[PDB]
Amino acid sequence: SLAEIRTDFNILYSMMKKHEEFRWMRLRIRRMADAWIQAIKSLAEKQNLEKRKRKKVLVHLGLLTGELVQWSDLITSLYLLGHDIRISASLAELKEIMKVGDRIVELIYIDIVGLAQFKKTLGPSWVHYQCMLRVLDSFGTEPEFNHANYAQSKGHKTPWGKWNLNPQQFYTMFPHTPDNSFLGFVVEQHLNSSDIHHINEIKRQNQSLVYGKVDSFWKNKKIYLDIIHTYMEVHATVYGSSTKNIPSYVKNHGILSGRDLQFLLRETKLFVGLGFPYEGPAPLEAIANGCAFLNPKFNPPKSSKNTDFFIGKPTLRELTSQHPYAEVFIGRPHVWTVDLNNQEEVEDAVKAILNQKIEPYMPYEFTCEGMLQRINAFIEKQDFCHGQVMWPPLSALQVKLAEPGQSCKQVCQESQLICEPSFFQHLNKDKKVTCQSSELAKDILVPSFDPKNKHCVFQGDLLLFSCAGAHPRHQRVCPCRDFIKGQVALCKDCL
Ligand SMILES: *[C@@H]1O[C@H](CO[C@@H]2O[C@@H](C)[C@@H](O)[C@@H](O)[C@@H]2O)[C@@H](O)[C@H](O)[C@H]1NC(C)=O
Ligand SMILES: *[C@@H]1O[C@H](CO)[C@@H](O)[C@H](O)[C@H]1NC(C)=O
């Protein structure tokens, strides 16, 4: 009934042998297995992992009836932590795994596809298991969209969301929506021992490498690159089917293996964002190998509102730059977020970059070990099956008052904290805000204070608490917590 840190992928490998569909994940796991095992050992030496209940866990990949990376890293983490995993990837496997006053599973990891299938399967008993769902939703689901009646009342047209879960049951690829939990993935290193001793030998050159494998992504960026070029060589890894948009002076390497790319990143001073693709791993991989990242700034920020790429998403989350995580959670000196319309700002950033030495940096949360700490913490401390939650600890709460036009998400972030939605239920009374009157409302923007009238508005619907949302007129009362540098998902007391 207690859980045992596994270090032998044999049992796993036979589990993942049972479908061709799993081959790509098998290969990923096999490749990283040494890193994965050093990780679980290393964690078990800095953390007592000896006192944990073995949990029976469904995982259902509707996807199989980016993602597969996260699935790989999740499934692997569940194994190394010693839990009893039932992988399903078909209606029949799911239907079999399911069909006294007990529960047949304690955790369920699933994607949006699988959730429709899970619901259709369990029918009425849905409710007996919904507190256990952990929904892999890369782009996230904001409370305004999760909550069906309210979405309808706001006239939202997207068929997505409307599941009425606790929004912390949504698991995202990057920490962009603090209404949801951050699961993430591991940024792979393709370097063995001989490469490590060789990684040293590589002398870094005053040369740039452009981010983008496709000629399309380069379109109308000549002015931007010409500024880079002024000061350093410009290398690419572009699939050269067409080169219509590639300046003549670009030194193309073509598509490289992960191994070869990492060696190239080691002789590169600057990795250059073109503005697409949005929040991918490549810039983390660059920063890890000691490159700086030139991060195009978005004015206005891009969202489901103004960008065809995001239309229909059940979230109004905005991108302030091509890589908001790199912008907010790494920043200078490693990351230089700059407006491409501001030619002077770009030139300055490039001049500044060329005159600083910066050490490599991989955030703890995007390693095998950080991921294991992070998932272990969610499994051991995050329970929705016993009503209102007590983790993270209330000791972590630090209230801020967002000014009109500012979300709780922003006010916490701008003060180097993260909005913690589980603290919202404790902001129910005024005990620099004193009310002369209060009312109840079912709105994502409350609790709110009107400092003109000294009128407070409290949340009347537990499912409408939102880190997301700004009041045009009023101040929002906001629950923030501290977080660990490199491990945003946790606070210091979160232990
Ligand atoms: C890389 O550049 C370092 C600093 O560069 C300086 O500023 C740029 C804008 C130019 O003015 C450049 O000539 C200056 O040195 C140098 O200290 C260093 O030698 C260079 N390293 C390599 C690998 O070439
Ligand atoms: C590292 O990988 C390369 C590339 O295939 C291989 O030839 C080399 O022998 C490896 N070195 C070690 C120490 O595993």
UniProtKB/Swiss-Prot annotation:
Detail which positions bind substrate: D137, S138, K313
**Major place of localization?**
Golgi
* Topological domain ranges for the Lumenal compartment: 1-495
Glycosylated position list: N192, N206
This enzyme catalyses: N(4)-{beta-D-GlcNAc-(1->2)-[beta-D-GlcNAc-(1->4)]-alpha-D-Man-(1->3)-[beta-D-GlcNAc-(1->2)-alpha-D-Man-(1->6)]-beta-D-Man-(1->4)-beta-D-GlcNAc-(1->4)-beta-D-GlcNAc}-L-asparaginyl-[protein] + UDP-N-acetyl-alpha-D-glucosamine = N(4)-{beta-D-GlcNAc-(1->2)-[beta-D-GlcNAc-(1->4)]-alpha-D-Man-(1->3)-[beta-D-GlcNAc-(1->2)-[beta-D-GlcNAc-(1->6)]-alpha-D-Man-(1->6)]-beta-D-Man-(1->4)-beta-D-GlcNAc-(1->4)-beta-D-GlcNAc}-L-asparaginyl-[protein] + UDP + H(+)
Molecular function, one GO term: protein phosphatase inhibitor activity
Q: Name one GO biological process term.
A: protein N-linked glycosylation
Record note on temperature dependence:
Optimum temperature is 50 degrees Celsius.
State the conditions that upregulate or repress this gene. Induced by IFNG treatment in monocytes (in vitro).
Q: How is its activity regulated?
A: Activity is increased by Mn(2+) and Mg(2+).
Which keywords appear in this protein's UniProt record, sorted alphabetically?
A: Disulfide bond, Glycoprotein, Glycosyltransferase, Golgi apparatus, Membrane, Secreted, Signal-anchor, Transferase, Transmembrane, Transmembrane helix
Q: What is the effect of changing E279A?
A: Loss of catalytic activity
Give the residue ranges for region: Important for activity in FGF2 release. 51-56
Entry protein name: Alpha-1,6-mannosylglycoprotein 6-beta-N-acetylglucosaminyltransferase A
Organism the protein comes from: Homo sapiens
